[PDB]
Symmetry: D2
Subunit: 234 residues, 4 copies
């Protein structure tokens, strides 16, 4: 199957597959079952920012998700991505809804990858606006691009209303050389801003930044808790 590294913003506690019992940020290493999570107070209708940092030297992948009021959740996990990911990846954003739903609107997304040495290859991109025809994004599933200049990872009605049973991803068009055996530093960071809104009995299921093999597609049966990322909950 695909190889996945993700930072999930998991709005829906699927405790029966190992979620903690609250919305959480988590770090997923080849499994929807986060290796580390932190409780996350998802702020309905508020614009959140998720910052993801992989420090290749410290071998530590960290994430924070914050809201303008300063409330944040952080998670770090010690991992050497050289041992996890293929050298070449796509990077992307994934979201899903299930029986419960929420908007999984991306308002901005940037990524920087650097491979040093022995000089530097780098890739940076920044989206503060997404066009109707956002040619440098591979949209998968229900993901669509704006207006309102946004990336809507999952189905939302034109009049704002999240759809259940939706899964969508957007991967940057170019493959990213995420590590190299001879790379002294293979670091990357990503940030995205998001607006998760639910009228629902509960928001679900979340948004993930993910890093996948280049040919990654939405696994069959990965709406809901899986979060467009994984074929199963193992």
């Amino acid at each position: 199957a695909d190889t996945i590294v993700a930072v999930e913003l998991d709005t829906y506690p699927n405790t029966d597959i190992g979620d903690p019992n609250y919305p959480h940020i988590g770090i997923d290493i080849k499994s929807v079952r986060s290796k580390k999570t932190a409780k996350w107070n998802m702020q309905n209708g508020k614009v959140g920012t998720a910052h993801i940092i992989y420090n290749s030297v410290g071998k530590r992948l960290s994430a924070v998700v914050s809201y303008p009021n300063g409330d944040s959740a952080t998670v770090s996990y010690d991992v050497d991505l050289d041992n996890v990911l293929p050298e070449w990846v796509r990077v992307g954003l994934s979201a899903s809804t299930g029986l419960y739903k929420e908007t999984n609107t991306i308002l901005s997304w940037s990524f920087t990858s650097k491979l040093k040495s022995n000089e530097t290859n780098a890739l940076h991109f920044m989206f503060n606006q997404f066009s109707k025809d956002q040619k440098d994004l591979i949209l998968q599933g229900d993901a669509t691009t704006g207006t309102d200049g946004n990336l809507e990872l999952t189905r939302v009605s034109s009049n704002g209303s999240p759809q259940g049973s939706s899964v969508g991803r957007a991967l940057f068009y170019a493959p990213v050389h995420i590590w190299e055996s001879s790379a002294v530093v293979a670091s990357f960071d990503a940030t995205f801003t998001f607006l998760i809104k639910s009228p629902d009995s509960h928001p679900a299921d979340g948004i993930a930044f993910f890093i996948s093999n280049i040919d990654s597609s939405i696994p069959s049966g990965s709406t809901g808790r899986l979060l467009g990322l994984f074929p199963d909950a193992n």
Copy 2:
């Protein structure tokens, strides 16, 4: 045909199609017939650096090609690329050889594009090493990468000898949103380092940084003086 914007480092004077009567740098707007050129002292077997800058605000596309000894050639041309390129492009490097030849070796290539509203979309990439399998490059024609870490735009026979009638291009894999209706600034810059060596009677034909439609292909019969860029010399 394709829509081409290029900075050519034209090593071979094809005076019958309007080249000046010397190696030159030129700015090509939809035609191999440079809109502006500057005499360029190509330094055989030395590593040169081409810096290309497009100032969206000043509407000026500028290039300098320099060598470590300080010798440089400069060309500017006033142009509004909004009126020239499609909104979405690929960027790349092209080189060709004809009846005469040269190595068209790219040692590094970086590109930065920014679309500014007040919010910014940006793309930056940097290649200081090219891998044998450089997945974020579209190699066209004779272009190859590695394992010496270089991008060889045209055929070079392994003991280092350039091949005649060779054309090759490397385009960045992702499409580039190079201008937008709504962009107050749609600037970009590109840098590449190159090694043109010719054992010959003359080097030919040159290297170009180019910006083309996304689906740009080497036009048929564009080895030689057409630099892998144009179908004809109009």
Copy 3:
């Protein structure tokens, strides 16, 4: 006297010293009388963005001022800053009021200078928030920072009314190496956002991004039309 290169967002037409008879953006080289201006529709109480770009290849000092509604004014002047500016400079933002006044509120300020040859010396700074004690800014005259996170270049009264006869500047703390003899490309760009509000008839006098000798000081009497930049209107 200081050496001043400035981009002025001149809100008040001082036609007696060669302002055109409208608000304008201007390129100033060692005179407050801009070498080039463009008519500027200043939008009272709206956040404008000024982008300023220069490189030593094109040698075109360009500036655009835009507002979110999409109105922009652009001015460019070819000028070889090697022959104007000292090698080392400070960069800054300056504003003034005279008989008439306006808030000259700076909301953000970014600047990048680069000196390139082989593959670079660079400086980049970005302020999206100014601190009450912004230790990397030299505030001169009436300029103040914080706690609203803004830089107020000129005097704003407690009731929000801007004051007349005010001048203030902020320069980045470090000297900037703006050109270097052996640099193949010396480039800078600057971006700032500003909020010019004038409760009535008329806003004055303007805001400028400037580059000056490192010890640059507000010239005495440089309120008003001298924009905190020039000792006189010559």
Copy 4:
């Protein structure tokens, strides 16, 4: 006393003050006795690169030192710099010699600090060439800027012989806002390349990248094992 956070490339084992008995990279928090070290194979006369990474999410101060042959040593220490450093700092490079000596030649140095949110303040500087009058560097002690275009932190004799009992530092001219209470991510990276040569088969004492109070100066008697950083070996 100054507050010092440093990454030391310690060439000389001072086992009497708790160095391990081999050249090492160390993370130093308010003591010369590194909180963490890794064994470092210092390659005399080869150009090394140190990369130093920290962000306030992962709070892992990481450093790698590498050489072009691909030998590297890495050290990381989780430390909450919010609780160590003043909010504003200067950043610098320091080196020393004592009884034994080495050139402590800096060939490049770059640095980026960013404070996100809710947007970004950033500082970036890069020196690949140092100048004789490098106005954006505060040189302390024996530190000199060339040509050769290098920063020589410690005294090197006319005949190229490094001198003993030398200490010198270069700090970037502007204060750096290293953390901020409301910032979701405060990050810094530093890289420098260095050339440590000892004719005397006995190199000492090392080079450090350091972050200190803005008024940091070379502690008296901080030659030798104190690396120009600490007043004592506590």
